[PDB]
Design a protein around this nucleic acid. Structure first.
Ligand SMILES: [Mg+2]
Ligand SMILES: [Mg+2]
Ligand SMILES: [Mg+2]
Ligand SMILES: [Mg+2]
Ligand SMILES: [Mg+2]
Ligand SMILES: [Mg+2]
Ligand SMILES: [Mg+2]
Ligand SMILES: [Mg+2]
Ligand SMILES: [Mg+2]
Ligand SMILES: [Mg+2]
Ligand SMILES: [Mg+2]
Ligand SMILES: [Mg+2]
Ligand SMILES: [Mg+2]
Ligand SMILES: [Mg+2]
Ligand SMILES: [Mg+2]
Ligand SMILES: [Mg+2]
Ligand SMILES: [Mg+2]
Ligand SMILES: [Mg+2]
Ligand SMILES: [Mg+2]
Ligand SMILES: [Mg+2]
Ligand SMILES: [Mg+2]
Ligand SMILES: [Mg+2]
Ligand SMILES: [Mg+2]
Ligand SMILES: [Mg+2]
Ligand SMILES: [Mg+2]
Ligand SMILES: [Mg+2]
Ligand SMILES: [Mg+2]
Ligand SMILES: [Mg+2]
Ligand SMILES: [Mg+2]
Ligand SMILES: [Mg+2]
Ligand SMILES: [Mg+2]
Ligand SMILES: [Mg+2]
Ligand SMILES: [Mg+2]
Ligand SMILES: [Mg+2]
Ligand SMILES: [Mg+2]
Ligand SMILES: [Mg+2]
Ligand SMILES: [Mg+2]
Ligand SMILES: [Mg+2]
Ligand SMILES: [Mg+2]
Ligand SMILES: [Mg+2]
Ligand SMILES: [Mg+2]
Ligand SMILES: [Mg+2]
Ligand SMILES: [Mg+2]
Ligand SMILES: [Mg+2]
Ligand SMILES: [Mg+2]
Ligand SMILES: [Mg+2]
Ligand SMILES: [Mg+2]
Lengths: 82, 149, 141, 129
RNA sequence: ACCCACUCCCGACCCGGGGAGGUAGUGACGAAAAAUAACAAUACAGGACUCUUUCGAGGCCCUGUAAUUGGAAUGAGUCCACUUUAAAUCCUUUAACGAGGAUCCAUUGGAGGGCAAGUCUGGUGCCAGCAGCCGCGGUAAUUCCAGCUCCAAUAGCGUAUAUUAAAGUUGCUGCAGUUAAAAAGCUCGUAGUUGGAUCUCUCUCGGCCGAAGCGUUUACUUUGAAAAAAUUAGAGUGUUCAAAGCAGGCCGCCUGGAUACCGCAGCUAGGAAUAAUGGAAUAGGACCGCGGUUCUAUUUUGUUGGUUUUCGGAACUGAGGCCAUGAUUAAGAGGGACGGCCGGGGGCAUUCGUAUUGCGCCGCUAGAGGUGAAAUUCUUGGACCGGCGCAAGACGGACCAGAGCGAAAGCAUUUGCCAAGAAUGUUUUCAUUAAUCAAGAACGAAAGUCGGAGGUUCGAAGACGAUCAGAUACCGUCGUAGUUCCGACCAUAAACGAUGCCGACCGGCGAUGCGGCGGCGUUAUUCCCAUGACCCGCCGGGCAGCUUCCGGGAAACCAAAGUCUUUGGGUUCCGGGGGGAGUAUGGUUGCAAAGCUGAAACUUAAAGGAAUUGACGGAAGGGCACCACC
């Protein structure tokens, strides 16, 4: 305590903190590139998706809504964007 | 804290610092606008439009891409709700609780919650009157509440 | 807490006067019942006619007989018990004689031993009790 | 709800100084807050501070030197004329040798001595010593 | 009472009149000045100062019994004369007289504390009395009645009453509400109060200025003007000083009769931080030019005359160009969406569980019940007990926790339906929509009141039996209203965290409930990802707990009851010594019971809160003794 630099927070404890309580608020979510097991072409998906994302180029269900992060279908791969 | 509940929760979205469109986003402002228009024709409120665009089409903030908010976009072209969506949802909730109450006369929690919902409706309606969104003679009536929704 | 805004003057003033009514002295002075009930009628002194000499028991911790007189005020006819201060001074007072009475010292409240007595005799037959007590003047005939 | 952000900032810095901490973070920030912190700067009571630009409202990280006894706000922001300034500083300041009353006049935000020099009254904001 | 002499007024008026006014009289309302002695010599209690060795000396300086001396100085009085004045009086000026107890004699209140000054003497003896308060007095009274002495103010000083300060005990500055008096039972809600970031003067007229607008309007701040005198502050000025007055000063002159202040509102001109308010989002936009539509004032023009245009002015306007054409941010503010959950939250229906009571049958039966002991009470017209069934109502044990839910009262068998809800998640949406709340509303334990239905258990009242000196009680038997459901009233609780709500900051630690985010490794499984059950952390909102020299507090204690004389984040209610009294009265609500609002007379020096020692206890633990026991 006492002499603790609030100007230069450490990255680990900055991620440790709540998203709204950081020096500058940074959301915890991200955008994923989801690849279906059979379809050759990728889809952009929100991590905390609240809707049943359907394959635009097929009938496969890509993710299911949950309390927090959306659950990807088994086999459907994903890569973090940016 | 909550307006009508004792709870004091801290749960909301945290928009990022960067207001620039991400490079991977290949959608143009016009494409986003047409997607918004057809989603509105499907019968969705601006909230649902934003959720669908964020979930499936990979746009973070429509205002961030098109330089303009969703409701303004809908009102600009013409197809916008007669009364604001939050007021509409409040009226719908009040109608539902009233319908439940008229048959369950013994329910006293429902009466209390209904009064809370009416207070919220009145506050919102008075605010919208002061901003000229609603006509000054617009008033909430239980008899015509179901008609409005 | 109290209101502190720039436009709260009326609230502060109204609250202050309403709460002022809860003060014992302020209510006594401004309600008007105390002045009506006061036998002197707000005067410092009064004049009365001696009705009878009476002896009042002192309060319990000390035993004594306080020599007082029943007087009838001229200005309103109210009857009062007044204390005759010094010793032998009761012998200076007769029946049906003019007496000038003052307060006892605490604003209509009983003083010391004597119970329910708030007046003391100052003059008897237009001559001061102190002058009679000290032999400076004698009782008129 | 939160009103008068200046009061919250001054309370935060006062509590941090009572606790002996070397830096304090204040949020939300404001131009009134920055001007008050700068008049506290020029008299050596606070030290260097830095503004963090969150796109909603900035934060201020304030370095603290142990020279600050009290800093507070006066609400409501009463209008002060030149005649009554003496009474105000007699009430608020601990001495005539040190301490400052801060006020907004049309000339800006400044301590009572500068307001006397410029012959301008205004509205009282707070005090520090 | 005297007078129009002064200040002024009236009249026809230089002339008359004026109880206006002036002058005296009374006058301790109150304010200013100011006597009641000073000195010298002695003699000393004497003292300091001084040398000496103690005396002494030290005769320098001071004080006092000085009923010791001594002359000096005076005005209080008496009183000529002036002076004063309209006439006088007073004061001032001056003759004469006028002081040793200088008797030419200071009083009013006190002497335990508060509060300055006698536990000296005599008298009284809880009497008389004193004493604002605490108290003093019952035979040695520091308190009464007196003598002596002493002290406070002093030509004044006591007393009663109003009022101010003391009173931060009305609190704007600046008080309090856990336990001392105090936060509404809970929530909603109009008015009120308060409210998050954000935005760095010119075109025309007249002689470069003077003019004109208008920059949205202000509030605020500074200036200027206008604002009776007296009073207040204050400059000058020796009234002999002073309170006063506005006078006065120099050898005819010289010089005053200032200045400040005067809320608020109303005028005035600068400043533009702060704080409100507006300016384009049906473009009911700005600027340039255009074009139109209409009406109209005058140019025409030595003149006349003639004359409709032109020009000028407007309103109504339609196409254009141009604006970088016009929307700040999305609050660790707030609504509203959306997702997976979660919970004794609520309503309707349904279902189950024993138990209790009663009934039918069967068995053996003489007791069974109750209590400290009994009795009242049911019993061979089978009581109690055991077994098999039936019914009626009530209630949901153990699981059940310093766990959960609800605004609070309150909420626990299964299942279904119905509408709700917090938290968490969120790069959704609106965009200030908010906080607290007179008026006005919803809910509100139990008891109680009107109707129905039902009435198992328990049970106010009541009838008995016990106990007791007595028992209208505590214990026991029976038992009405009630207890249960529905529909209307009632709106009160120690409705309690005896602690308003919203927001910020200020220490640690381990748990726990819900949601989300990670991570080895065990389990359902036997293999697949799962998803559940554990385990190790993180975040957020909760019920709490321990700890701490955060800091507070009278302390108990409180991480809020902290961030308070270093006193101001917003806002509601509400207290002001104890009783009378939540009483009387009026109003209002209610069928009623009662609820809400709510005094005064009068009485009283304490009542009260925390904490410390003892004493006590029919509270719990130990220990000891043949004046205990074994
Ligand atoms: Mg609210
Ligand atoms: Mg005359
Ligand atoms: Mg005359
Ligand atoms: Mg007269
Ligand atoms: Mg005379
Ligand atoms: Mg007098
Ligand atoms: Mg005097
Ligand atoms: Mg004389
Ligand atoms: Mg004396
Ligand atoms: Mg004496
Ligand atoms: Mg005394
Ligand atoms: Mg003394
Ligand atoms: Mg006295
Ligand atoms: Mg005494
Ligand atoms: Mg007073
Ligand atoms: Mg004071
Ligand atoms: Mg007090
Ligand atoms: Mg209390
Ligand atoms: Mg409460
Ligand atoms: Mg309101
Ligand atoms: Mg603001
Ligand atoms: Mg004046
Ligand atoms: Mg003067
Ligand atoms: Mg003015
Ligand atoms: Mg937001
Ligand atoms: Mg027998
Ligand atoms: Mg049986
Ligand atoms: Mg059970
Ligand atoms: Mg009310
Ligand atoms: Mg009700
Ligand atoms: Mg009830
Ligand atoms: Mg009942
Ligand atoms: Mg009934
Ligand atoms: Mg019974
Ligand atoms: Mg009896
Ligand atoms: Mg009984
Ligand atoms: Mg009550
Ligand atoms: Mg209470
Ligand atoms: Mg969990
Ligand atoms: Mg995990
Ligand atoms: Mg937790
Ligand atoms: Mg305070
Ligand atoms: Mg309240
Ligand atoms: Mg009282
Ligand atoms: Mg009545
Ligand atoms: Mg009331
Ligand atoms: Mg105690």
């Amino acid at each position: 305590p006492l002499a603790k630099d609030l100007l230069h927070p450490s990255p680990e404890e900055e991620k440790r903190k709540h998203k709204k309580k950081r020096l500058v608020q940074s959301p915890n979510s991200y955008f994923m590139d989801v690849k279906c097991p059979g379809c050759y072409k990728i889809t952009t998906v929100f991590s905390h998706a609240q809707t049943v994302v359907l394959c635009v180029g097929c009938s496969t269900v890509l993710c299911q809504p949950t309390g927090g992060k959306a659950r990807l279908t088994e086999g459907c791969s994903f890569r973090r964007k940016q | 804290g909550r307006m009508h509940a004792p709870g004091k929760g801290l749960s909301q979205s945290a928009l990022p610092y960067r207001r620039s469109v991400p490079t991977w986003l290949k959608l143009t402002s016009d494409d986003v606008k047409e997607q918004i228009y057809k989603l509105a024709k499907k019968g969705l409120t601006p909230s649902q439009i934003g959720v669908i665009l964020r979930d499936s089409h990979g746009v973070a903030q429509v205002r961030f891409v098109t330089g303009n908010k969703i409701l303004r976009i809908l009102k600009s072209k013409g197809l916008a709700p007669d009364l604001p969506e939050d007021l509409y949802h409040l009226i719908k909730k009040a109608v539902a609780v009233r319908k439940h109450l008229e048959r369950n006369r013994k329910d006293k929690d429902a009466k209390f919650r209904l009064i809370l919902i009416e207070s919220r409706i009145h506050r919102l309606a008075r605010y919208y009157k002061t901003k000229r969104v609603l006509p000054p003679n617009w008033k909430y009536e239980s008899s015509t509440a179901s008609a409005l929704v | 807490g109290k209101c502190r805004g720039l436009r709260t003057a009326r609230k502060l003033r109204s609250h202050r006067r309403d709460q002022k009514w809860h003060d014992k002295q302020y209510k006594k002075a401004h309600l008007g019942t105390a002045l009506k009930a006061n036998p002197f009628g707000g005067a410092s002194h009064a004049k009365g006619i001696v009705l009878e000499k009476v002896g009042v028991e002192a309060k319990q911790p000390n035993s004594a007989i306080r020599k007082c007189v029943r007087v009838q005020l001229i200005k309103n006819g109210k009857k009062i018990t007044a204390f005759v201060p010094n010793d032998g001074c009761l012998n200076f007072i007769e029946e049906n004689d003019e007496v000038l009475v003052a307060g006892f010292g605490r604003k209509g409240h009983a003083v010391g031993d004597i119970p329910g007595v708030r007046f003391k005799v100052v003059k008897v037959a237009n001559v001061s009790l102190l002058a009679l007590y000290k032999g400076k003047k004698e009782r008129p005939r | 709800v939160r009103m008068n952000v200046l009061a919250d900032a001054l309370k935060s810095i006062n509590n941090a100084e009572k606790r002996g901490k070397r830096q304090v973070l204040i949020r939300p920030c404001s131009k009134v807050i920055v001007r008050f912190l700068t008049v506290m700067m020029k008299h050596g009571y606070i030290g260097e501070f830095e503004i963090i630009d969150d796109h909603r409202a900035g934060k201020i990280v304030v370095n603290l030197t142990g020279r600050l006894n009290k800093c507070g706000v006066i609400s409501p922001r009463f209008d002060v004329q030149l005649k009554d300034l003496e009474k105000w500083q007699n009430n608020l300041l601990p001495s005539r040798q040190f301490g400052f009353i801060v006020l907004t006049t049309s000339a800006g935000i400044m301590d009572h001595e500068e307001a006397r020099r410029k012959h301008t009254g205004g509205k009282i904001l707070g005090f520090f010593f």
